[PDB]
Amino acid sequence: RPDFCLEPPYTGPCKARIIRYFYNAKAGLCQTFVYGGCRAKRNNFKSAEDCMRTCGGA
């Protein structure tokens, strides 16, 4: 539901390739994206289930 769930996914300035989830309000689901391993925003979940419980409904 909440407003950070509408924000676009943020890879950030660190250079790991770590697969995380973000709420895609356009699709109405949680997708994967590459997170660089630092300075995460709040639309950034470690599993689709966490992502769905927080955001699903935004």
Partner: protein, 223 residues
């Protein structure tokens, strides 16, 4: 690595892949049981892969060993990225041969315009996405502190340096994190962070390994 070249199989024998189901980060083999990597690569359930070239197919020189311990620098700051260094102890000792070999810690710090090799399996597009199968390499000079600090105002600490080309096109990128910057056979850097990849006026930022050598050796010996 954007703008690099295929190293050629097993020719960077101290390069490791960190695996959590997939390749997420690089690292350097410092002896038979210790690897050094970046603190932002810290995960649980790491497996280290040694002797990789094509990380996607088993070619028969591999050793896959689990980590026993992962020790992120006690002063790592996840906001400022300062002290972006971590050590990983292998569950068991690798065997060291010609495809798998460790890299020497430096005795001193490298100067501006020393030429280094940065290697990794990270994205090869500056804007775009394309992860290679084989290991990629790039020669890039160390930059001056002063120009590093002008590239990134008020973000460079005494533990970072900048390496690369102010013109853009050659850099390390997502995937490369925790891998080596090796300059005249010594381990000077760890791939750490940047503003995107291979952007003009925004060279990559590396952990300055020469500052940590005393911390590494004593931490290796006492764990």
């Amino acid at each position: 690595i954007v703008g690099g070249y295929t190293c050629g199989a097993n020719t960077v024998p101290y390069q490791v892949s960190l695996n959590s189901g997939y390749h997420f980060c690089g690292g350097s083999l410092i002896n038979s049981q210790w690897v050094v990597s970046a603190a932002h690569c810290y995960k649980s359930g790491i497996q280290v892969r040694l002797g990789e070239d094509n990380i996607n197919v088993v070619e028969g020189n591999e050793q896959f060993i689990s980590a026993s311990k992962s020790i992120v620098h006690p002063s790592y700051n996840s906001n400022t990225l300062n002290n972006d260094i971590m050590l990983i102890k292998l569950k068991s000792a690798a065997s060291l041969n010609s495809r798998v070999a460790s890299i020497s810690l430096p005795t001193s710090c490298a100067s501006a315009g020393t030429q280094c090799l940065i290697s990794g399996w990270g994205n090869t597009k500056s804007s775009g996405t394309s992860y290679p199968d084989v290991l990629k390499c790039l020669k890039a000079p160390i930059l001056s502190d002063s120009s590093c600090k002008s590239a990134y105002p008020g973000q460079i600490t005494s533990n970072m340096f900048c390496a690369g080309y102010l013109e853009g096109g050659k850099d390390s990128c997502q995937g490369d994190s925790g891998g080596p910057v090796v300059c005249s056979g010594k381990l000077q850097g760890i791939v750490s962070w940047g503003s995107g990849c291979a952007q003009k006026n925004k060279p990559g930022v590396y952990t300055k390994v020469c500052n940590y050598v005393s911390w590494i050796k004593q931490t290796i010996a006492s764990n």
